């Protein structure tokens, strides 16, 4: 009997070029500080474990042996290797329960190297994707540019990874990783810092000792850059309720090592939440964060490991019906005056469908409204069963007739309140991960 939900463990650890201690089980049990897992769940395995490392000094063979031993000790299950991929000292391991070996297909791996010349050679990202039954899953482990003064370079690294990491279905040619997966998890040493003056270091340390994180989180560069729509547009993160995970003295967690030294290039490392887990799932699909925290007992690195766990909705492929898009229009931020057409892509279609050109008019601010009227092709899904169709998504790309390049991409849920009824639909449109416009109109879904 096929599951409707699985549980996914995400771990991120910057190992600080040191080997791990003998026992790392606390990481995989979600024990320590923050939103932690209940003791009563300790022996219950997660379906999929995704382990991201940075500054990893081990061989693939050495680290795989440690991970499989740790999980065997916790669960009495011998986990199967789905994928492993390493770029320099940045690594991703995906392990799954053996009962899932025939549920997992289309495994892909890739990496991106960020920067150019002297910034090219240790920062970037690794990724894995696969299908679990009918559900596509993507996982990204990035190690972004270091240093409190380099937030804009981190945002540029993000944009490069999002654009160039080649995962998921290659037929989705208009779409980047932010639209190719039912569920996308993006984690790593993202290296965003708490932006307070360097002379406040001792004040920050006393706030951490009091477990008073609010005045530090209000200066966390990732939270402020996300609020300003500069990075991770349309991603989610669980609330942080654990101490900063960087930068610790090794072999204890009692001291933060913040002061400038020759070894840090005379940079301050004020305590920061460098180590993060974010996600982006298709609209209305079940995804719940069940833990988000840091370990307290793993002390070989200047970072503490971070864990996050999720309940994630999955579907079967189910191996007459109709989707009608009515009175639709795109509002674009572009100054271009080409004509545009749409492509509709979905796992529920045999192949993507191209629309005729829309009718351009000038909007209120002078910006571009592209009108599609009642002109859009009726989409014919391969299965009409409402238990299948209402769980599906239509990916939309708006493309230039002159260049055939996408100006914007979005996603529409078929999880409607009604069938055979005209209902409002809406997605933002993004391109290279930044907002380019909006798509709005009405839908009518025919099922059996």
Swiss-Prot record:
Q: In which tissues is it expressed?
A: Specifically expressed in immune and hematopoietic cells. Expressed in bone marrow and blood cells. Levels vary considerably within this compartment. Present in at least 74% of immature CD34+ cells, whereas within the more mature population of CD33+ cells, it is present in only 10% of cells. Present in the majority of T-cells, while it is present in a minority of B-cells (at protein level).
User: Which top-level group of life is the source organism from?
Assistant: Eukaryota
Q: Any idea where this protein resides?
A: Cytoplasm; Cell membrane; Membrane raft; Cytoplasm, Cytoskeleton
Per the record, what about its domains? The SH2 domain interacts with tyrosine phosphorylated forms of proteins such as SHC1 or PTPN11/SHP-2. It competes with that of GRB2 for binding to phosphorylated SHC1 to inhibit the Ras pathway. It is also required for tyrosine phosphorylation.
The similarity comment for this entry is:
Belongs to the inositol 1,4,5-trisphosphate 5-phosphatase family.
What is the role of the protein in this entry?
Answer: Phosphatidylinositol (PtdIns) phosphatase that specifically hydrolyzes the 5-phosphate of phosphatidylinositol-3,4,5-trisphosphate (PtdIns(3,4,5)P3) to produce PtdIns(3,4)P2, thereby negatively regulating the PI3K (phosphoinositide 3-kinase) pathways. Able also to hydrolyzes the 5-phosphate of phosphatidylinositol-4,5-bisphosphate (PtdIns(4,5)P3) and inositol 1,3,4,5-tetrakisphosphate. Acts as a negative regulator of B-cell antigen receptor signaling.
Protein name (Swiss-Prot/TrEMBL): Phosphatidylinositol 3,4,5-trisphosphate 5-phosphatase 1
Source organism of the structure: Homo sapiens
Full-protein interval shown: 399 to 856 of 1189
């Amino acid at each position: 009997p096929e599951p409707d939900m699985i549980t996914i463990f995400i771990g991120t650890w910057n190992m600080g070029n040191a080997p791990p201690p003998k026992k790392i089980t606390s990481w995989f049990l979600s024990k320590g500080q923050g939103k932690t897992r209940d003791d009563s769940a300790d022996y219950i395995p997660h379906d999929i474990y995704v382990i991201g490392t940075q500054e990893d000094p081990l061989s693939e063979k050495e680290w795989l042996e440690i991970l499989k031993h740790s999980l065997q000790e916790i669960t009495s299950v011998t986990f199967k290797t789905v994928a492993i991929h390493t770029l320099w000292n940045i690594r991703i391991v995906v392990l799954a329960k053996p009962e899932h070996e025939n549920r997992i297909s289309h495994i892909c791996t890739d990496n991106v190297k960020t920067g150019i010349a002297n910034t090219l050679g240790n920062k970037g990202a690794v990724g894995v994707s696969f299908m679990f039954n009918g559900t596509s899953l993507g996982f990204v482990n990035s190690h972004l540019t270091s240093g409190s003064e380099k937030k804009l370079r981190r945002n540029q690294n993000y944009m490069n990874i999002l654009r160039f990491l080649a995962l998921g279905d290659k037929k989705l040619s208009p779409f980047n990783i932010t639209h190719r997966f039912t569920h996308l998890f993006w984690f790593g040493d993202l290296n965003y810092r708490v932006d307070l003056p360097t002379w406040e270091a001792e004040t920050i340390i006393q706030k951490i000792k009091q477990q008073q994180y609010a005045d530090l989180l209000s200066h966390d560069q990732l939270l402020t850059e996300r609020r300003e729509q500069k990075v991770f547009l349309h991603f989610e993160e669980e609330e942080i309720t654990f101490a900063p995970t960087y930068r610790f003295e090794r072999l204890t967690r009692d001291k933060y090592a913040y002061t400038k030294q020759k070894a840090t290039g005379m940079k301050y490392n004020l305590p920061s939440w460098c180590d993060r887990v974010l996600w982006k799932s298709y609209p209305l699909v079940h995804v719940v964060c069940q833990s988000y925290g840091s370990t307290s007992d793993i002390m070989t690195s200047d970072h503490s490991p971070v864990f996050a766990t999720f309940e994630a909705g999955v579907t079967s492929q189910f191996v007459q019906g109709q989707i009608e898009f009515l009175r639709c229009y795109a509002t674009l931020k572009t100054k271009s005056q080409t004509k545009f057409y749409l492509e509709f892509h979905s796992s529920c279609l045999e192949s993507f469908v191209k629309s005729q050109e829309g009718e351009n008019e000038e909007g209120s601010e002078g910006e571009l409204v592209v009108k599609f009227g009642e002109t859009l092709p009726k989409l014919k899904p391969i299965i009409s069963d409402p238990e299948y169709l209402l769980d599906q998504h239509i990916l939309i790309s708006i493309k230039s007739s002159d260049s055939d390049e996408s100006y914007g991409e979005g996603c529409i849920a078929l999880r409607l309140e009604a069938t055979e009824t005209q209902l409002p639909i809406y997605t933002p449109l993004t391109h290279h991960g930044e907002l380019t416009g909006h798509f709005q109109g009405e839908i009518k879904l025919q099922t059996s």
